[PDB]
Amino acid sequence: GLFGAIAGFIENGWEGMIDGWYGFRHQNSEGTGQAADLKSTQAAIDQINGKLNRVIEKTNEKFHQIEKEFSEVEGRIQDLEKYVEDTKIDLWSYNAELLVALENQHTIDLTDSEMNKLFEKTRRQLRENAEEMGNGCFKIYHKCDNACIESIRNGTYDHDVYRDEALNNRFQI
Amino acid sequence: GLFGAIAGFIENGWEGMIDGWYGFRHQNSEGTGQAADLKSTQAAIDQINGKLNRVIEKTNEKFHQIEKEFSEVEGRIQDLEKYVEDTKIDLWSYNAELLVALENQHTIDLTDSEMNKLFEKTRRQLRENAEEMGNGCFKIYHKCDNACIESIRNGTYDHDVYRDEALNNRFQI
Amino acid sequence: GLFGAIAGFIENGWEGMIDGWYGFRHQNSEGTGQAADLKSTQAAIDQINGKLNRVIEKTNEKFHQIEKEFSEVEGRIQDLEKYVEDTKIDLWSYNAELLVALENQHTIDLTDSEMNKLFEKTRRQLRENAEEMGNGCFKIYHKCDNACIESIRNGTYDHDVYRDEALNNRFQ
Amino acid sequence: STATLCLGHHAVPNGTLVKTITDDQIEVTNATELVQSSSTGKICNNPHRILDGIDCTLIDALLGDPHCDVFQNETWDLFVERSKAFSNCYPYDVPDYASLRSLVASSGTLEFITEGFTWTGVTQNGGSNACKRGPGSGFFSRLNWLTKSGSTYPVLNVTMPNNDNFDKLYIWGIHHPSTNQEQTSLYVQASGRVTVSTRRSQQTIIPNIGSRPWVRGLSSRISIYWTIVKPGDVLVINSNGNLIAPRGYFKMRTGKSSIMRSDAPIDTCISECITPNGSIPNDKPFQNVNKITYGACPKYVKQNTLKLATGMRNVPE
Amino acid sequence: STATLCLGHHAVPNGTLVKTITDDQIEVTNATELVQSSSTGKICNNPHRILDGIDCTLIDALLGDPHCDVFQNETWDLFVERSKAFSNCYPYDVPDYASLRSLVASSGTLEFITEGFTWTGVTQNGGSNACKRGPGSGFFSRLNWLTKSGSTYPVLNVTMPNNDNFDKLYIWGIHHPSTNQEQTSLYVQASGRVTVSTRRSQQTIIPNIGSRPWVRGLSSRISIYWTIVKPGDVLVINSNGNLIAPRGYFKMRTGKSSIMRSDAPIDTCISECITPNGSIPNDKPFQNVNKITYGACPKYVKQNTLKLATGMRNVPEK
Amino acid sequence: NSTATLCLGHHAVPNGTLVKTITDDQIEVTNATELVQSSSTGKICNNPHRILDGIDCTLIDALLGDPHCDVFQNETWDLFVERSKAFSNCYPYDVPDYASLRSLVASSGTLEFITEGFTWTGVTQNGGSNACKRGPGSGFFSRLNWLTKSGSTYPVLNVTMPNNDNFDKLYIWGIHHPSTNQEQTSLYVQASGRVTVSTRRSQQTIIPNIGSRPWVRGLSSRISIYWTIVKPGDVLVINSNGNLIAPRGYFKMRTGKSSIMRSDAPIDTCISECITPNGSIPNDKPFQNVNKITYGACPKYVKQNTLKLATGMRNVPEKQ
Ligand SMILES: CC(=O)N[C@H]1[C@H](O[C@H]2[C@@H](O)[C@@H](CO)O[C@@H](O[C@H]3[C@H](O)[C@@H](O)[C@H](O)O[C@@H]3CO)[C@@H]2O)O[C@H](CO)[C@@H](O[C@@H]2O[C@H](CO[C@]3(C(=O)O)C[C@H](O)[C@@H](NC(C)=O)[C@H]([C@H](O)[C@H](O)CO)O3)[C@H](O)[C@H](O)[C@H]2O)[C@@H]1O
Ligand SMILES: CC(=O)N[C@H]1[C@H](O[C@H]2[C@@H](O)[C@@H](CO)O[C@@H](O[C@H]3[C@H](O)[C@@H](O)[C@H](O)O[C@@H]3CO)[C@@H]2O)O[C@H](CO)[C@@H](O[C@@H]2O[C@H](CO[C@]3(C(=O)O)C[C@H](O)[C@@H](NC(C)=O)[C@H]([C@H](O)[C@H](O)CO)O3)[C@H](O)[C@H](O)[C@H]2O)[C@@H]1O
Ligand SMILES: *[C@@H]1O[C@H](CO)[C@@H](O)[C@H](O[C@@H]2O[C@H](CO)[C@@H](O[C@@H]3O[C@H](CO)[C@@H](O)[C@H](O)[C@@H]3O)[C@H](O)[C@H]2NC(C)=O)[C@H]1NC(C)=O
Ligand SMILES: *[C@@H]1O[C@H](CO)[C@@H](O[C@@H]2O[C@H](CO)[C@@H](O[C@@H]3O[C@H](CO)[C@@H](O)[C@H](O)[C@@H]3O)[C@H](O)[C@H]2NC(C)=O)[C@H](O)[C@H]1NC(C)=O
Ligand SMILES: *[C@@H]1O[C@H](CO)[C@@H](O[C@@H]2O[C@H](CO)[C@@H](O[C@@H]3O[C@H](CO)[C@@H](O)[C@H](O)[C@@H]3O)[C@H](O)[C@H]2NC(C)=O)[C@H](O)[C@H]1NC(C)=O
Ligand SMILES: *[C@@H]1O[C@H](CO[C@H]2O[C@@H](C)[C@@H](O)[C@@H](O)[C@@H]2O)[C@@H](O[C@@H]2O[C@H](CO)[C@@H](O)[C@H](O)[C@H]2NC(C)=O)[C@H](O)[C@H]1NC(C)=O
Ligand SMILES: *[C@@H]1O[C@H](CO)[C@@H](O[C@@H]2O[C@H](CO)[C@@H](O)[C@H](O)[C@H]2NC(C)=O)[C@H](O)[C@H]1NC(C)=O
Ligand SMILES: *[C@@H]1O[C@H](CO)[C@@H](O[C@@H]2O[C@H](CO)[C@@H](O)[C@H](O)[C@H]2NC(C)=O)[C@H](O)[C@H]1NC(C)=O
Ligand SMILES: *[C@@H]1O[C@H](CO)[C@@H](O[C@@H]2O[C@H](CO)[C@@H](O)[C@H](O)[C@H]2NC(C)=O)[C@H](O)[C@H]1NC(C)=O
Ligand SMILES: *[C@@H]1O[C@H](CO)[C@@H](O[C@@H]2O[C@H](CO)[C@@H](O)[C@H](O)[C@H]2NC(C)=O)[C@H](O)[C@H]1NC(C)=O
Ligand SMILES: *[C@@H]1O[C@H](CO)[C@@H](O[C@@H]2O[C@H](CO)[C@@H](O)[C@H](O)[C@H]2NC(C)=O)[C@H](O)[C@H]1NC(C)=O
Ligand SMILES: *[C@@H]1O[C@H](CO)[C@@H](O)[C@H](O)[C@H]1NC(C)=O
Ligand SMILES: *[C@@H]1O[C@H](CO)[C@@H](O)[C@H](O)[C@H]1NC(C)=O
Ligand SMILES: *[C@@H]1O[C@H](CO)[C@@H](O)[C@H](O)[C@H]1NC(C)=O
Ligand SMILES: *[C@@H]1O[C@H](CO)[C@@H](O)[C@H](O)[C@H]1NC(C)=O
Ligand SMILES: *[C@@H]1O[C@H](CO)[C@@H](O)[C@H](O)[C@H]1NC(C)=O
């Protein structure tokens, strides 16, 4: 993908995450846990649904047309009737082939994009209290209990509360 | 958008910015101010113009064609004449519909992209003298007067001048 | 490009890089050097080949069709024959024109993307041991010999080894 | 002490392969099919009015082949012609059969108004054992076979103005006898002719004596022709032999009507889109069932499957 | 001691909704219309040469219906047929009328060269009160109605070679009398015939006696046919009755000429694209005015509006 | 120092290629490839398709059996090539709807002809003309049988021929248009001829037309050609009291990939799937600008003479 997250710096996906498309796994002093991020999941789903709604259930109504099967050979007019229809089908077949190719390439890039957006959104919250391990995981440099982890996940994490503690752990051996 | 800037980590646009597409707002010791960034504005405008010029004013010259309205019922030939034209119109109508959809999706992503490019360009200038608040704003960790702000905006900011001061304010208590 | 790397924060390309599409240049205590990154080069090439294989060598087989040149004027049927074919050609000509435009715009963005991916991949390895000068170059804040540079290039650089030294030089 | 927070995305054990710009086949978490490739095998009788031709072609229903009498004044959105339809009246041909079929199919009605043509000096209602109605001989219900009266067959000159505010379709014909003996005993004159005209058009047909293949006992034939008469215009039929006269006109309408060849059974259900293979749903944008369609139908394409990605790239553990 | 620098983008109070891949309607700062949907109602007389048919169809101008005489030798880029047009000569039909109309329309000229056909043993210049020119009876200006001379109508056998370096279009016809009495008093023979041939093609038409509806006093009719004669080839007209002879040929050209049915008035202005509704500008790639077009025109589409985004996503300040 | 610098970058070339994109009319990339085939060798390759060179003969003259086209009897083709130097040299004729007969024979791909034993009672067979010389003497189309009176009588012919085979039969026949009444009566006795050819479901009736046409090979008279397809189970009936140009049998009808092409390109020993009147072209590219007329596995014809597909990144050289 264009953003290098899915099938990129995130090595692989999670079969165990059945309640969402994107999410968090953590390890803290209280143990380990998993939770889906609903906002990013919904962003991807909404876009795909919109895309899907533009493609599906839009059909034109045609009634009397030309004939397309013939029981006798007739020559010039029948040649033209057959050629018109064959020309039409090929052009529509091309349209269909290109449509799916463009759409699918885009769907992959868009989902890749949302993964990356969630990563950057989280990075930004954490400010100087965390570093990036390069595999989609942050090392948070302070004691961060289940409440603290949930505060990151629901976007209310206050970096100032933990900054002194984090800066101390980061820049000291 | 794919880059998550416009309608993303930047909450909204500025109706008050009438002299450019992208720009800066600041608060320093001397007060507050607003200024457009002309380089990024021009990047977006140029791309949209180029796109627009490819689509508009490229036209086929056709003279004698087939007839498309009929005063009598004739059957087979007229069926074919009507079907040919109706087939043509539907294929062109599809082309037009897809063109606008692709173009517009791209225009949104490209403008989103330029916003992000300006952000990253600014981030890079500031080096270790600023942190990123996550809403499109940088906290600059040193006294930065109107000249200093303008130096960031016109791409001549020298981070080394302020580094000692900034590093001191960033990492304390 | 959409990612702002190629023809963006990287000022220009390297004519002197003849062994790859993307790569590294360095200066350390042991001297200077250039090396291509094969993984990113191959990523771009693979995608372009795939794109190319979808476009090329997919051809319709058509045998008996309608006539398309005429020696006499006949009127209504010939008008229709000519119009059918002219309509077909214009629609195909449009398809061809749009195809190339979309493909080429995408190829530029995809190659731009890979440049950016390699940059971010490198940034991530270096952690707090390097800063970004803003022109595609990192300043590495520790002695980093030829082995150390190669460790960055082949993705095995251990930031912990150099962290104390780097943090000392950066902040002071 | 510290903590670790990893961001990630889901994956499934059983992904779907899809096509993209750069990839012939690449695995995503889920996809949806855009080409409708199956049918129930049955034509749904709603919402469109479907008229089953059963043993009758539209043309035989038009002309009034005795076994197609049930179709008098019928109407349809889609007339379905069955492959086991058969003709069972006088052997006939229609020059430009396809057009007459098309234009009647498109009109969508066999509504027929009888008009009082006066045929002076000729015998009406001629019939044949090739076209039995009941036990006795008969003929097409909408055509009037004229023959001599006594020793004479005069020059017929009959007219019928369209004073209505709609178009009238007149179906008529000419009789081709198999021998000269037959020609003279029916029409007196050795050589017949039929000239049917309106103010802006005309048709003149000369019959041709001679043998054709035996059909239902007969080497002779009838040839069918038609004439549309606009409001204000007037029909003139002129003949000194061999005329198969019209009994009136068919009303011409415009609308959504058509015709289809299919042997699919008709069934009680709702489906906007009809194909010769049966009705198909139109939830998908494309279909691979049949290029012949009626109604709100997906576009026919050559591909049998096109998968649209409805999820991210699938990168399993 | 510190400062804040926020990056941002503009917004407008009055955005425009557009369509995208993922969105049916989404607001951007500005858009531009790609479908031309209006016309002035008038056909501009430049840059194309527009010939107004007024009371005449092209075919009546060709044949030479007296009230269409003003069109002799005329030329056009676009011939405009008006709905008020009418015929006022001998009642006629043209089998495959559409094709003759098309091929003359496309040629773009009614330039006519008179040739000296010698018709031996027949009376020329027959006329009718169905086709008055002046107070007296008349006929199509480009056709010569032949009838018996005295008690006889012989087998006409005339030739006319194309020695020029261009194609000749010959318009001719056959007369269908209403009665046998009429057939014999005009042409002597009870059954006429017309055979017009070139080296590679032929047409033979037999007339049909009988009554048609009354048009301008007449139950009889004329049927029109045509023959193209290539350079080096030669026309042969052969008939023993009912021939409506040609007086010469029409020159055939190829170019950008055509025909259009419209009641739009013609006006002094410049416009490359013409529709039956009037001229339209061609600055936009698509149009919704009419599928019938002439000139450098936008492609006709079913949509009435298609907006192309010319600005970013609009996220108003709130 | 003691520090190090590591710069990331990408390549560039001195000689880039300009390409078109969505936002750009011309923009330089490192490399591109051409998608429009615009050249030909000028020669039609004789593989893999079976090419039959018409030489001096149109397909219709090969069908009818113009003496100088006798070499084409029972021939078959994937593509029949008609040359501009072709000429007719038999009885002067026309084919109403010539295009269709040409098309349907072209598409069938065979002139395989089976002679049938039609019995023509009371008429003279094998009529010929000096307009159609075979050897030194007069002759006629090899697949047509010109019937004329026998001894001052020309009776009403009523001949039949059922299709009992499991394939379609194509019958070519015609009618003779004499130039004078004298000619009509001395050939056919009756002052007015007629031909009615019919199957169970269809019929054609043609009346001949007396009169002079331009001189072609000594003759003001003409023949007009017609055809009739007879399905399995059906039956042909020919009925005439004068002017019939009778068939000698039927042509077998096939379906497949056969067609016809007008070209003066020479044929050559090579392999090429795609044929145009300008000669064979390769089909490695998706589009072509050589000719809208094509046969085989061919690129789609487009109006553009060049379309470049980018196969590399944006080209941004450093030097000046
Ligand atoms: C009408 C009829 O019954 N025709 C019989 C026919 O009968 C006539 C015949 O005996 C002649 C002899 O010269 O005499 C006629 O009487 C005349 C009378 O002398 C005269 O004074 C008076 O003024 O006029 C009458 C004639 O109007 C007899 O009427 O005998 C022949 C020979 O056997 C029969 O031929 C066979 O015809 C078969 C098909 O029969 C039908 C049919 O299609 O079913 C019968 C229909 O009644 C008849 N319909 C009409 C409207 O005429 C049709 C029709 O003629 C044909 O379809 C036209 O093509 O024929 C079958 O062809 C068989 O092979 C023949 O032998 C004939 O039916
Ligand atoms: C041709 C003509 O004027 N016909 C009159 C016709 O008078 C002719 C008739 O008496 C014959 C007798 O055999 O003699 C002709 O004169 C010949 C003369 O006797 C002879 O000595 C000499 O050698 O030759 C001449 C000419 O050959 C008479 O001319 O009388 C009938 C019956 O009363 C008239 O019928 C009416 O016709 C009306 C329409 O008239 C026109 C028309 O279209 O306006 C007049 C035109 O002059 C005439 N044009 C030509 C080229 O003939 C046409 C034309 O005949 C028709 O259009 C063909 O369809 O007719 C109207 O139809 C009315 O209802 C009739 O009663 C007839 O005019
Ligand atoms: C009817 O009139 C037409 C046209 O005016 C004539 O075609 C036709 O006969 C003409 O016949 C003569 C011979 O009878 C042909 O002349 C030949 O020309 C040759 C030179 O190229 C010469 O070598 C021959 O020996 C002939 O003399 C003449 O071409 C032919 N004209 C045309 C145009 O075909 C007339 N026929 C009747 C029955 O009246
Ligand atoms: C002209 O010739 C044709 C064919 O040679 C003659 O047609 C044939 O006529 C006979 C007797 O009328 C038909 O025989 C019948 O066959 C049916 C069906 O099997 C059977 O039920 C009858 O009892 C009878 O045997 C035969 O089918 C028919 N053949 C064809 C091909 O039409 C025709 O009669 C001749 N006409 C004249 C006027 O000479
Ligand atoms: C053939 O039969 C038809 C059917 O009636 C006849 O057509 C009619 O012919 C008469 C002339 O006798 C026309 O009468 C004229 O009507 C106009 C009214 O507009 C009037 O002004 C005249 O004084 C005259 O009376 C009538 O219009 C005409 N109708 C049609 C539809 O053609 C025809 O006359 C018959 N011919 C023969 C030879 O029997
Ligand atoms: C077929 O219909 C015609 C026409 O009658 C129409 O009347 C409409 C109100 C409507 O019912 C429509 O379906 C129908 O088609 C009948 O022929 C004649 O119609 C005229 C004028 O419409 C009447 O004045 C006559 O009464 C009528 N003829 C009769 C009753 O003999 C016609 O009867 C009908 N045929 C059949 C077999 O039903
Ligand atoms: C984000 O998550 C935190 C931690 O779970 C939430 O804070 C708790 O809220 C509940 C109910 O309001 C209280 O009873 C707890 O005592 C809170 N714990 C704290 C503040 O440490 C917080 O409400 C969440 N916010 C949102 C917007 O979802
Ligand atoms: C729908 O019906 C048509 C009947 O014509 C089917 O098309 C035929 O398919 C068979 C293969 O089973 C071929 O042998 C025939 O040559 C085809 N005929 C034509 C005219 O295309 C079609 O397969 C049916 N499709 C479905 C989904 O039922
Ligand atoms: C241009 O002219 C055509 C005339 O055909 C107009 O189309 C007709 O419009 C009327 C009134 O809306 C409809 O009742 C007809 O059904 C239309 N006919 C056809 C054939 O489409 C068309 O609306 C005109 N457009 C403009 C912009 O003037
Ligand atoms: C024309 O080709 C065919 C073979 O397809 C020959 O026609 C007859 O073929 C049948 C077998 O189908 C044989 O019984 C006959 O011997 C053939 N007819 C005659 C009159 O001999 C025919 O021989 C071929 N002619 C040429 C010149 O090749
Ligand atoms: C392909 O062969 C065709 C033969 O017709 C060429 O088409 C003609 O080209 C000439 C010279 O440019 C033009 O004057 C004609 O207008 C063309 N004729 C038609 C019918 O289009 C064509 O140029 C050849 N191209 C190549 C590459 O060989
Ligand atoms: C940038 O702004 C600074 C401060 O006002 C000014 O001194 C300098 O000239 C500007 N540089 C450029 C290149 O415009
Ligand atoms: C990477 O480079 C280092 C330094 O040269 C080398 O020792 C190490 O083995 C390399 N690792 C891989 C996986 O190639
Ligand atoms: C795949 O996508 C469709 C359409 O959005 C959806 O209805 C369905 O839930 C998905 N299928 C599975 C197995 O998850
Ligand atoms: C029409 O044009 C030709 C030459 O251009 C001329 O000879 C002829 O007399 C002209 N006729 C009229 C009526 O102007
Ligand atoms: C240009 O592109 C084609 C297709 O990928 C390739 O075969 C060729 O090597 C490329 N040219 C260069 C100089 O790399």
D316 contact A CB<8A: yes
In sequence order, the β-bridge partners of residue E52 are: E80
What is the Cα gyration radius of chain D? 29
> How far away, in angstroms, is D91 Cα from ligand 1 center?
17
D304 contact A CB<8A: no
DSSP state letters, D102-170: HHHHHHTB--EEE-----TTEE----BTTS-SSSS-B--TTEEE-EEBTTB---EEEEEE--SSS-EEE
C78 contact A CB<8A: no
CA distance F229 to F236: 9
Sign of CA dihedral F178, F182, F187, F193: positive
Q: Is D84 exposed, middle or buried (0-12, 13-18, 19+ CB in 10 A)?
A: exposed
CA distance E23 to A106: 14
- Chain C residue with minimal CA distance to B117? C4
Technique used to solve these coordinates: X-ray
Task: With beta carbons less than 8 A apart as the criterion, state whether F265 and F279 touch.
Answer: yes
Give the list of residues 6+ apart from residue D76 with CB closer than 8 angstroms, or none: D49, D50, D51, D108, D109, D257
CA distance D102 to D85: 18
Task: With beta carbons less than 8 A apart as the criterion, state whether D44 and D267 touch.
Answer: yes
Q: How many domains does chain C have?
A: 1
SS3 state at F64: helix
- Beta strands, E only, A29-107: 31-37, 61-62
> How far away, in angstroms, is D131 Cα from ligand 1 center?
15
A131 contact C CB<8A: yes
Nearest residue to E206 (alpha-carbon basis) of E241, E181, E171, E236 = E241
Cis preceding-peptide flag for F198 (omega within 30 of 0): no
Nearest residue to A61 (alpha-carbon basis) of D272, D109, D76, E288 = D272
DSSP state letters, chain C: -TTSTBTTTB---BTT--S-SEEEEEEETTEEEEEE-HHHHHHHHHHHHHHHHHHTT--EEE-S------SS---HHHHHHHHHHHHHHHHHHHHHHHHHHHHHHHHHHHHHHHHHHHHHHHHHHHGGGEEE-SSSEEEE-S---HHHHHHHHTT---HHHHHHHHHHHH--
Nearest residue to E196 (alpha-carbon basis) of E157, E164, E233 = E157
Nearest Cα of chain F lies from the Cα of A76 at a distance, in angstroms, of: 5
First to last CA, chain A: 39
Q: For E213, what's the count of Cα atoms within 13 Å in the CB-facing half-sphere?
A: 20
Nearest Cα of chain F lies from the Cα of E193 at a distance, in angstroms, of: 8
CA distance C130 to D75: 84
Q: What is the signed CA dihedral for C49, C51, C57, C58, rounded to 10 degrees?
A: 150
**Which amino acid, one-letter code, is at F215?**
W
- The bridge status of strand D193-197 relative to strand D202-205 is antiparallel
Task: With beta carbons less than 8 A apart as the criterion, state whether E223 and E93 touch.
Answer: yes
CA distance F26 to F19: 5
SS3 state at E170: strand
What is the resolution of the experimental data for this entry, in Å?
2.8
Give the list of residues 6+ apart from residue F174 with CB closer than 8 angstroms, or none: F93, F144, F223, F224, F225, F226, F244, F245
- The backbone torsions φ and ψ at residue C118, rounded to the nearest 5 degrees and listed phi first, read -65, -35
Give the list of residues 6+ apart from residue D35 with CB closer than 8 angstroms, or none: A96, D284, D286, D287, D288, D298, D301, D303, D304, D305, D306
| CATH architecture entry for E49-264 | Alpha-Beta Complex (3.90)
- Chain A residue with minimal CA distance to B81? A66
Interchain proximity F199–D213, CB inside 8 Å: yes
In sequence order, the β-bridge partners of residue F242 are: F194
Nearest Cα of chain E lies from the Cα of F126 at a distance, in angstroms, of: 25
Task: With beta carbons less than 8 A apart as the criterion, state whether F179 and F212 touch.
Answer: yes
Nearest residue to E57 (alpha-carbon basis) of E92, E84, E91 = E84
- Chain D residue with minimal CA distance to F237? D212
- Of residues C92, C95, C117, nearest to A8 (C-beta): C117
Q: Is A151 in the pocket of ligand 7 (CB under 6 A)?
A: yes
> What chains are in contact with C, requiring at least 3 Cβ pairs below 8 Å?
A, B, D, E, F
Q: Give contacts of A77 with chain B, Cβ < 8 Å.
A: 76-77, 80
From residue D255, how far is each of D31, D77, D108, D274 by CA, in Å? 39, 9, 8, 17
**Which amino acid, one-letter code, is at D16?**
T
Q: Is B156 in the pocket of ligand 12 (CB under 6 A)?
A: yes
Q: F160-191: buried (b, 16+ CB within 10 Å) or exposed (e) per residue?
A: bbebeeeebbbbbbbbbbbbeeeebeebbbbe
Measured in whole angstroms, the distance separating CA E239 from the mean position of its chain's CA atoms is 30
Task: Kindly indicate whether the domain formed by F50-265 is annotated with CATH number 3.90.209.20.
Answer: yes
Q: Is E165 exposed, middle or buried (0-12, 13-18, 19+ CB in 10 A)?
A: exposed
Q: Give contacts of E203 with chain C, Cβ < 8 Å.
A: none
CA distance D236 to C81: 37
CA angle A20, A22, A28 (to 5 degrees): 100
First to last CA, chain D: 30
Q: What is the signed CA dihedral for E285, E286, E289, E294, rounded to 10 degrees?
A: 60
Task: With beta carbons less than 8 A apart as the criterion, state whether E149 and E82 touch.
Answer: no
CA distance B151 to B126: 11
Supply the DSSP symbol for F299. Answer: P
Q: Which of C69, C70, C76 to mutate to test the interface with E (most CBs of E within 10 A)?
A: C76
Cis preceding-peptide flag for D47 (omega within 30 of 0): yes
**Which amino acid, one-letter code, is at F179?**
S
**Which amino acid, one-letter code, is at D209?**
I
In sequence order, the β-bridge partners of residue E3 are: B140
Atom of ligand 8 nearest to the CA of D288: 27
CA distance F94 to F92: 7
Assign residue B119 a region: left if phi > 0, alpha if psi is -120 to 50, beta otherwise? alpha
In sequence order, the β-bridge partners of residue D266 are: D43
- The bridge status of strand F274-276 relative to strand F148-149 is unpaired
Supply the DSSP symbol for F307. Answer: -
Task: With beta carbons less than 8 A apart as the criterion, state whether C21 and C3 touch.
Answer: no
Which long-range contacts (C-beta less than 8 Å, at least 24 apart) are formed by C162-167? C162/C129, C163/A173, C163/C127, C163/C128, C163/C129, C164/A173, C165/C141, C166/C128, C166/C129, C166/C130, C166/C140, C166/C141, C166/C142, C167/A171, C167/C128, C167/C129, C167/C141
Task: With beta carbons less than 8 A apart as the criterion, state whether E184 and E191 touch.
Answer: no
Task: With beta carbons less than 8 A apart as the criterion, state whether E304 and E289 touch.
Answer: no
Which long-range contacts (C-beta less than 8 Å, at least 24 apart) are formed by E251-255? E251/E107, E251/E109, E251/E111, E251/E112, E251/E113, E251/E166, E251/E168, E251/E169, E252/C73, E252/E107, E252/E166, E252/E167, E252/E168, E252/E169, E252/E228, E253/E107, E253/E108, E253/E109, E254/E106, E254/E107, E255/E108
Q: Is A87 in the pocket of ligand 7 (CB under 6 A)?
A: no
Give the list of residues 6+ apart from residue B136 with CB closer than 8 angstroms, or none: B5, B9, B10, B11, B119, E6, E7, E8
Q: Is D179 in the pocket of ligand 4 (CB under 6 A)?
A: yes
Task: With beta carbons less than 8 A apart as the criterion, state whether D264 and D278 touch.
Answer: yes
Angle formed by the axes of helices C76-126 and A76-126, nearest 10°: 20
First to last CA, chain E: 30
In sequence order, the β-bridge partners of residue A137 are: D6
CA distance C145 to C28: 6
SS3 state at B92: helix
SS3 state at B96: helix
Measured in whole angstroms, the distance separating CA A24 from the mean position of its chain's CA atoms is 16
Task: With beta carbons less than 8 A apart as the criterion, state whether E174 and F66 touch.
Answer: no
First to last CA, chain F: 32
Interchain proximity A29–D300, CB inside 8 Å: no
Q: Token pair for residue B169?
A: 């304010």
From residue D242, how far is each of D147, D228, F137 by CA, in Å? 8, 21, 47
> How far away, in angstroms, is E61 Cα from ligand 2 center?
27
Q: For C43, what's the count of Cα atoms within 13 Å in the CB-facing half-sphere?
A: 19
F217 contact D CB<8A: no
Q: Is C39 exposed, middle or buried (0-12, 13-18, 19+ CB in 10 A)?
A: middle
Name every residue in C having a CB less than 8 A away from some CB of E: 72-76, 79
- Of residues C73, C76, C79, nearest to E228 (C-beta): C73
- The bridge status of strand D92-93 relative to strand D221-229 is parallel
Q: Token pair for residue A155?
A: 């976007």
First to last CA, chain B: 40
Q: Counting one residue from D and one from E, how many pairs have CB atoms under 8 Å apart?
A: 38
F204 contact D CB<8A: no
Q: Domain range holding C119?
A: 1-172
Task: With beta carbons less than 8 A apart as the criterion, state whether E85 and E60 touch.
Answer: yes
Q: Token pair for residue A45?
A: 């789903």
CA distance F251 to F247: 10
What is the Cα gyration radius of chain A? 27
Nearest residue to B96 (alpha-carbon basis) of A99, C96, E287 = E287
Q: Give contacts of C109 with chain A, Cβ < 8 Å.
A: 2
Nearest ligand, CA E251: 15
Measured in whole angstroms, the distance separating CA A142 from the mean position of its chain's CA atoms is 31
Q: B134-162: buried (b, 16+ CB within 10 Å) or exposed (e) per residue?
A: bebbbbbbbbbeeebbbbbbeeebebeeb
What is the Cα gyration radius of chain F? 30
A118: part of which helix (H) or strand (E)? Answer: helix A76-126
CA distance A1 to A35: 24
Interchain proximity B24–E7, CB inside 8 Å: yes
CA distance C110 to D22: 10
From residue A146, how far is each of A16, A40, A119, F17 by CA, in Å? 20, 21, 19, 57
CA distance C86 to F84: 25
Q: How many CB atoms lie within 10 A of CB F159?
A: 16
CA distance F111 to F250: 10
Q: Token pair for residue C63?
A: 């045998």
- The bridge status of strand F249-252 relative to strand F113-115 is antiparallel
SS3 state at E204: strand
Q: Token pair for residue E178?
A: 């209403």
Task: With beta carbons less than 8 A apart as the criterion, state whether D189 and D158 touch.
Answer: no
Interchain proximity E22–A51, CB inside 8 Å: yes
Q: Is B114 exposed, middle or buried (0-12, 13-18, 19+ CB in 10 A)?
A: buried
Measured in whole angstroms, the distance separating CA D20 from the mean position of its chain's CA atoms is 44
Task: With beta carbons less than 8 A apart as the criterion, state whether A128 and A167 touch.
Answer: yes
Task: With beta carbons less than 8 A apart as the criterion, state whether E176 and E207 touch.
Answer: yes
Q: For E284, what's the count of Cα atoms within 13 Å in the CB-facing half-sphere?
A: 22
From residue B137, how far is each of A131, B40, F38 by CA, in Å? 20, 17, 56
Sign of CA dihedral E216, E218, E221, E222: negative
CA distance E135 to D279: 68
CA distance E293 to E273: 7
Task: With beta carbons less than 8 A apart as the criterion, state whether E121 and E153 touch.
Answer: yes
In sequence order, the β-bridge partners of residue D218 are: D215
Q: What is the signed CA dihedral for A115, A121, A125, A128, rounded to 10 degrees?
A: 80
**Which amino acid, one-letter code, is at A135?**
N
Nearest Cα of chain D lies from the Cα of A53 at a distance, in angstroms, of: 11
In sequence order, the β-bridge partners of residue E195 are: E204, E238
Residues composing chain C: 172
Sign of CA dihedral D81, D83, D89, D92: positive
> How far away, in angstroms, is F76 Cα from ligand 11 center?
29
CA distance F147 to F121: 10
Interchain proximity A69–D283, CB inside 8 Å: no
E305: part of which helix (H) or strand (E)? Answer: none
Interchain proximity F310–C23, CB inside 8 Å: no
Q: D138-154: buried (b, 16+ CB within 10 Å) or exposed (e) per residue?
A: bbbbbbbbbbbeeeebb
Residue numbers preceding breaks in chain B (C to N > 2.5 A): none
Q: Is D219 in the pocket of ligand 4 (CB under 6 A)?
A: yes
Q: Token pair for residue B70?
A: 């009929």
Q: Token pair for residue E232?
A: 């080096």
Q: Token pair for residue B111?
A: 């403008």
First to last CA, chain C: 38
Nearest residue to D314 (alpha-carbon basis) of D13, D34, D20 = D13
CA angle D238, D239, D241 (to 5 degrees): 170
Nearest Cα of chain D lies from the Cα of F81 at a distance, in angstroms, of: 31
CA distance F11 to C10: 11
Q: Give contacts of E24 with chain A, Cβ < 8 Å.
A: 50, 53-54
Interchain proximity F209–E193, CB inside 8 Å: yes
